[PDB]
Amino acid sequence: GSSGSSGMALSKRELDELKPWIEKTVKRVLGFSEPTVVTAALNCVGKGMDKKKAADHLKPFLDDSTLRFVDKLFEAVEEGRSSRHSSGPSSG
Write down the domain spans for the chain: 11-81
The residues, any chain, with a CB within 8 Å of residue 87's CB and separated by 6 or more, are none
* Separation of alpha carbons 41 and 2, rounded Å: 22
CATH topology of domain 11-81: PWI domain (1.20.1390)
Method: NMR
CA angle 31, 18, 25 (to 5 degrees): 10
Other C-beta atoms closer than 10 Å to the C-beta of 41 total 31
- Any idea how long the chain is? 92
Residue 54 burial class via C-beta count within 10 angstroms: exposed 0-12, middle 13-18, buried 19 and up: buried
**How many whole angstroms separate alpha carbon 50 and alpha carbon 48?**
7
Q: How far is CA 6 from the centre of its chain?
A: 15
